[PDB]
Amino acid sequence: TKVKYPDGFRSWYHVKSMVIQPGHPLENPFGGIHHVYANAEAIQGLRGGNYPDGAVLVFDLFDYQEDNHALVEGKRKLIGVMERDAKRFSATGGWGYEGFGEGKPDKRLVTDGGQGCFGCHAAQKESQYVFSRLRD
Amino acid sequence: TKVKYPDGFRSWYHVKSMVIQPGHPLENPFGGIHHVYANAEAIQGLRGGNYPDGAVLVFDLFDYQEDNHALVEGKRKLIGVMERDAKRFSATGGWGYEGFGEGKPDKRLVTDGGQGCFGCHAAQKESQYVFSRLRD
Ligand code: HEC
Ligand code: HEC
Ligand SMILES: [Zn+2]
Ligand SMILES: [Zn+2]
């Protein structure tokens, strides 16, 4: 019933990126520069298919340093992970939600079976609980 | 003698990202959110191996918009492209330099054989004229 650590996600397709600066509603704990990655199965859902079991999306969050009006990536803060399994994760709309502190497999962040994550993602039910959209 | 448009570069490994904001010395013309991509041959050279002819690095530059203490990706401004051919691009350190406006294959930007690009990259001779470093 645990989300698997998504080994090798850095080699996956880069969906998009966004900077969340101090003052943003999501600052705690998602402040920083994040990159969204999708495995092959998740790309099927992002393209307008149904997300297959085994789809994984990763929210890869870095600290940044503002230096002379450049925002420069610092250390990895955490990753967020969504793992599709319609049966195993039925209580949170078919996605398992986990966080890994500093992107380390032994630093699991979710302590409520992913209900809090799901509570916010639920608004995106019509896009299968996923915020990020494919871009060129 | 022309640098090839790097078709399918959006499927390549994402090396790193950076934001260049107003008041930074590179704001014209590199202001925005940029993502660096590397093909297989470029990964060999980055990882600390040497760069094979055929290595390609892409600088993918987006305008961004301010949205309530987030910086959100906007339209693509341009791509920069370095293609390795030690013999063909010998006049610019063995990399061919090209810009494509809005990332469109039909909007080539470089008019001086890439000597302007190379002038800045020459400072990075000890890393084979590449600024970007691999990160986790
Ligand atoms: C200094 C005034 C520069 C000039 C002129 C050009 N580039 Fe460059 N480039 C510069 C920097 C500081 C960086 C690193 C950005 C980062 O995120 O660390 C880059 C990077 C590239 C890359 C990616 C590979 C690398 O060397 O890191 C490419 C593909 C690239 N630049 C291409 C490019 C082209 C085609 C230029 C002339 C049109 C050009 N650059 C000029 C700094 C400078
Ligand atoms: C209060 C709102 C909110 C909460 C709580 C939340 N997120 Fe999300 N999450 C977002 C938003 C907004 C995005 C889209 C970011 C973007 O567009 O770059 C996002 C994106 C993601 C993504 C990339 C896929 C997508 O849907 O775009 C993953 C993976 C993710 N979140 C995981 C988590 C996990 C794991 C938790 C709990 C540990 C969680 N999130 C909590 C708002 C939330
Ligand atoms: Zn405010
Ligand atoms: Zn600033």
Written in H, E and C, the secondary structure of A13-55 is: EEEEEEEECCCCCCHHHHCEEEEEEECHHHHHHHCCCCCCCCC
- What phi, psi does A72 have (nearest 5°)? -110, 130
A68 to chain B, closest Cα gap in Å: 6
DSSP letter assigned to residue A112: S
User: Cis omega (within 30 of 0) on the bond before A52?
Assistant: no
Please tell me what resolution, in angstroms, this structure has: 1.6
Reading the block at residue A23, the tokens are 């003052």
User: Is the separation of the CB atoms in B71 and B33 below 8 Å?
Assistant: yes
What single letter denotes the amino acid at residue A10? Answer: R
CA distances from residue B107 to A71, A91, B75, B96, B104 in whole angstroms, order as listed: 28, 50, 16, 16, 6
Q: Which residue CA neighbors atom 18 of ligand 2 most closely?
A: A18
| Closest partner CB to A73 (pick from B17, B69, B73) | B17
Those residues whose C-beta lies under 8 Å from the C-beta of residue B75, and which sit 6 or more positions away, are: B62, B63, B102
Question: B120 and chain A: CB distance < 8 Å anywhere?
Answer: no
Q: How many independent structural domains does chain B possess?
A: 1
* Whole-number Å distance between alpha carbons of B65 and A120: 23
Can you tell me the distance from the alpha carbon of B66 to that of A19, in angstroms, rounded to the nearest whole number? 10
Residue A66 annotated as binding site: yes
Report how far residue A59's alpha carbon sits from residue A15's, in angstroms, rounded to the nearest whole number: 10
Which one of B17, B34, B120 would you pick to mutate in the ligand 1 pocket, going by the greatest count of ligand atoms within 8 A of its CB?
A: B120
At A115, list the tokens. Answer: 């209900």
Say which ligand is closest to the CA of B69.
Answer: 3
How many angstroms away from the CA of B48 is the closest CA of chain A? 17
d(CA A82, CA A4): 10
Q: Which of B13, B68, B18 lies closest to B39, judged by CA?
A: B13
- Domain interval for residue A70: 1-136
In this complex, the residue of A35, A70, A136 whose CB is nearest that of residue B18 is A70
CA of B65 to the centre of ligand 3 (A): 15
**CB-based pocket (< 6 A), ligand 1:** B 16, 18, 36, 57-59, 80-82, 97-99, 110, 116-117, 120-121, 130-132
Is A45 in contact with A128 (CB distance < 8 Å)? yes
Alpha-carbon separation of residue B108 from A4, B42, B57, B79, B102 (angstroms): 44, 22, 16, 10, 10
Locus of tokens 């293609």 = B83
Using alpha carbons, select from A106, A110, A50, A40 the residue that is nearest to residue A81.
A110
Of all ligands present, the nearest one to the C-alpha of A78 is: 2
**Which experimental method was this entry solved with?**
X-ray
- CB under 8 Å, gap of 24 or more: what pairs does B22-25 form? B22/A69, B23/A68, B23/A69, B24/A68, B24/A69, B24/A70, B25/A68
| Residue B8 CB burial class (10 angstroms; 0-12, 13-18, ≥19) | exposed
Distance CA B107, CA B86 (A): 25
How far is it, in rounded angstroms, from Cα A30 to Cα B122? 38
* Contact between A5 and A105 (Cβ < 8 Å): yes
Cα atoms found within 13 Å of the Cα of residue A69, Cβ hemisphere only:
12
